[PDB]
Structures are given as C-alpha cells and as structure tokens.
Amino acid sequence: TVAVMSYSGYDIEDALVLNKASLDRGFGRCLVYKNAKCTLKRYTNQTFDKVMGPMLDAATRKPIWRHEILDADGICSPGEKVENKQVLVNKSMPTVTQQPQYKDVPITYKGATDSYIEKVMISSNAEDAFLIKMLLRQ
Amino acid sequence: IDSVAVLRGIQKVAMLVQGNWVVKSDILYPKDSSSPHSGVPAEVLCRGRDFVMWKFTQSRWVVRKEVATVTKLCAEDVKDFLEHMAVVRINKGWEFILPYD
Amino acid sequence: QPMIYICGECHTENEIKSRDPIRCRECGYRIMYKKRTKRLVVFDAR
Amino acid sequence: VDVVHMDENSLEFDMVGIDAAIANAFRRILLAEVPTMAVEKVLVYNNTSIVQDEILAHRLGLIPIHADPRLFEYRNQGDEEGTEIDTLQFRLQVRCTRNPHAAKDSSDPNELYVNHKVYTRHMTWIPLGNQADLFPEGTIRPVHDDILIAQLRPGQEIDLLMHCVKGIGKDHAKFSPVATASYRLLPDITLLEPVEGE
Amino acid sequence: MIIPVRCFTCGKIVGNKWEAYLGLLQAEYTEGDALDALGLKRYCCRRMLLAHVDLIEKLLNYAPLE
Ligand SMILES: [Zn+2]
Ligand SMILES: [Zn+2]
C-alpha cells in the first residue's frame, strides 16, 4: 500500500520510507539458503579421509565450544544454530605427501551472522568418495 | 460416408446426451492414469465422471453446491473436468455450452 | 547409541554403521539424510 | 461524548470539543502504548514440518492471546525463565498420521489424513504455580480458534512451547491491541442555493 | 508459502479467512462478493486473500512421507 508523498526528508534521491509495523507483521521477510559441501576421497595408496567424533572437555563432559553442534558421527546436526568459526565436518586427511598420521582440516562456518542447519545430505559417488552437503538457512 | 452403418462404431466411442454428443470415459483415462494436475495427487475413478454425466442425463443440470462431498473427491477434480464442457453461472453450477438440437 | 539416517526416496531408517557403500537397505536409493537433533533450540517470535 | 455503535470487538463514538493534539494522542496511545500479551520465546522439540522454524515462531508471535494484561508485570532484563507473575505458557503438540479407513478413490486430504491442518485450537494452556485458581477454565486461550499455523503430511510432527509476556506496541507490532484505531472530522455539506428539478 | 496471520497494513487477523474463502468460492460466489461476506472492508485486507498463492499445498507434494 503506497502513498506517494514527500515525508520526513529521508526520501530525497530514490530512498523510500517503510512502515515499522508492516515489517513486523511479515512484509519483506526473506530467507537466504547457502551451501557447504565436503568430500572424503579414497587415495591410490590404500588410505582414506575420516571424520573424527567430537572432542570432549573432560572437566565438564560436554564438547568444546568449537565442536558444540556436532553429532556423534562428527557431522553437524540439523536443527541447531551455527555461530562463527564453529566446525561442521570434523575432517582429517593423511599426510602421505609406517602407521598413518592425520592432520585436521575442519570445515568451519565462516560468516558474520548466525545460521540454522536445515538438512544434511550424505551420498557417495562410484569412486568410493563420500559426498556430504549441508543446507544453511538465515 | 456410410452414414448409417457407422453408428455401431460411433456408439463405442461417443453417446448422445441432451441433444449432443459427449465423449465416453474410456477415451480419456484408462484405469492406471496418474493425476493430470498439481496439488494433492488423486487416482482415476471413471464412474466418478460417469455419475456426473449421468446427472446431466436425468436432471436439467448439476444444480447443488457441494456434490464434491457426496462423491468425496477433490473440488479441484470436479471443477476442472466440468471446465472443458461448460461455462459458470452464479451459484447454479455450469451452463451447457450449446443449444438443444 | 547408533547412528540412524533417513533414506531419500522411501523415508526408512537405515543405521549405516560399518564402512559400506551408501545404499538404502530396502530400496536401491543411494542418498541419505540425517535426522533432526534432540537438543532444543530457542527462537524469538519476531 | 456520544457513543453511536458498539458490539463485540468494535466501537464507534464521538468526541466534541477536544482538539487535534489530544485526539491524536489518544490514537497514538491506542496504537503503540497500550500493552498486551504475546508470544516471544518458542522452544522447539522436533519440528519436522515444511514450515521453517523461524517462520513458525514468527507466525506464533502474531496470534492474539486472551490474557488480560492488567494482571501481569513486565519481565525484567534477562530472566529468561519467568515466573507466575509475569508469563504464560502454551504447548503445541501435533502429530500427523494416516486415516486407517477411507474410500478407495481417496482424493481429498480431509479423508486421507488426520491432524494435517494445525489450527490454533491445538494450543493447550499450561499453568504455572497458582495460575490455576487466579483464572477459571477458558479465560486463558487464543482468541480466534481457527487460525492456520502450519500444514502437515503423515509422518511430520510439530512440538513446541511458547512463553507469552507483556509488552507495548511501540516495541513490536504483535503487541498492538487494535486492528485499526482512527478518526475523522465530521462533515457538514451545506447547500448555498436551493437545488430543484432534475 | 502460506497465508499470513495478519494483514501487513492495518493488522486485522486475516489468517483464519482462507479456508472459508475457498469454501465460499465452492458455493460459486464472485471474489468481490465473498470478500464482502467475510467482513473485509478496506482494500489492504482484501488483497491478502485476493493476491495470495497457496504454494504449501503444492510444496507438500514433494515433501517426504511415510
Ligand atoms: Zn530407500
Ligand atoms: Zn488490512
């Protein structure tokens, strides 16, 4: 519903004034869906990437803050909110460049504002690679 | 054309109702067809059409508000099927599109 | 205690535990989805 | 003051002798400074509907609540639990299933499913402390009894917990007690010359 | 996706008029008569039902089910 008038002086060059009690009731409400995918490949050497579980705090028996939203299979769970620099997939790759040694390469949520996880997709290609996609909602 | 013998062919594919021909049910949908529209899917039920065209044979028209409750199926089926043969007048259903020859 | 995933086509619990190719136990569909968590989340009604 | 019409949920009346700068003040108080009770916190356990949780919380925020706001106090800064004095608490819990008996043609959703529409009659009030006796049965409810919230398919489930608090309309527009409050001056169309004929 | 609970402009609770609006269109009213019979005076409330598209009825076809 548009009234065409000169109001309040904040509408000089193409700027337009809105209604605060219309934005509260649902006008202009948008959703932004993003993506975060991670692959877990098998190498020519018989070694493979892996997802470790959440690393607990022994004094509190709760996970650490950077691993707060992870499920028991190392993958972030749908329904919970992510803040900045929390992990989503607890990946570990081999440094093959006798026992294999792993380094950590976690998929973390870079982003200035929070996001809710809606669904986590798990599928596999034909090359034994595991594909993991997350849908993120703001 | 052999315009006298051919009615034993035409009787199998069309039947005369209210002075005019009406397409028979088996031409449009055999009994395994999926819903042709969006919204909630529905299964085919040809007597759910044939009862409607039967009502046009006995009454003047289908004349009442809520036949979709009596026949249980979607309004989105009945009001879409009817829309290929008729035009709406206010409250009294649909109008038969061509005069009584 | 085990993990439970949801099939993409038929919506059945699969419980993928060992290192197996990702495949539904009942259909042949090869995409899984995680379940919703059991922890609560708190929203503002704004 | 001449009251000319009144029924349930409407009122029309006249004020003679007051000026614009006070009638406008009354309109602005009725829009933005008269407090009501509305949902602010929604605690979610297993939302599996297609409606997003933020959108669902936003829809549950705007439902008007029949609590009388002269009886409650403002929740303090912080204090995320809230007690008997300053909150109410509704519980929505709907599970959708298939109807085990239906016809074979089975087209409409009203025969195939049950609880596939979440109205606001599925909200059940949960008392706190002594609120069971300060209020009789039925005075704490949502008002409209028919507002669609979500809509489900069998297997999907909605279970949450609401926390109504007190707030004014200047803060957020779900606290406004009125649909629209306004006025107009009264017309006096006058005839300068006698109009006759056609 | 779904009918909003309130009108954006004034604040009348529109969100319970949708299932009744479809039922009055099943009784073969015109839209200008059904919107008057539901009690919508101003046009800001009338465009809430008049311009709404019910996408959740068709988005729920693609939702996963048992
Ligand atoms: Zn399957
Ligand atoms: Zn309005």
| Residue the block writes with tokens 């249980």 | B72
* Domain D33-178 sits in CATH 2.170.120.12: yes
> Around Cβ D168, how many Cβ atoms within 10 Å?
17
Q: What are phi and psi of A76, to 5 degrees?
A: -65, 145
Distance, CA of A46 to CA of A92 (rounded, Å)? 15
B and A interact (at least 3 Cβ pairs within 8 A): no
- Phi/psi at A66 (5° precision): -70, -25
In angstroms, the CA D59 to CA D39 distance is: 10
Structure tokens at A107: 């998929």
Whether chains E and A touch (3+ CB pairs under 8 A) is answered by yes
How was this structure determined? It was done by: cryo-EM
* CA of A58 relative to ligand 1 center, distance in Å: 40
d(CA D194, CA B59): 60
| E strands present in A1-138 | 33-40, 50-51, 56-57, 62-63, 81-82, 87-89, 91-94, 102-104, 107-108, 115-124, 130-137
Q: Dihedrals φ, ψ of D148, to 5°?
A: -70, 135
Can you state the percent helix, strand and coil of chain D, rounding each to 5? 20, 25, 55
Q: Which run of H or of E encompasses E65?
A: none
Resolution in angstroms, to 1 decimal, for this deposition?
A: 3.1
CB-based contact, C40 to chain D, within 8 Å: yes
d(CA D93, CA D113): 17
Neighbour count for residue A62 (Cβ, 10 Å): 11
Structure tokens at E22: 């479809």
Of A25, A116, A118, the CB nearest to D62: A25
Find how far residue D177's CA is from the centre of its chain: 9
User: What percent helix, strand, coil does chain C show, rounded to 5?
Assistant: 0, 25, 75
- Backbone torsion region of residue D21, taken as left when φ is above 0, otherwise alpha when ψ lies between -120 and 50, otherwise beta: alpha
Q: Where are the domains of chain C?
A: 1-46
Bridge partners for A116 per DSSP: A81, A137
Question: How far does the CA of residue E35 sit from the closest CA of chain D (Å)?
Answer: 17
CA-nearest of D131, D140, D11 to D68 is D140
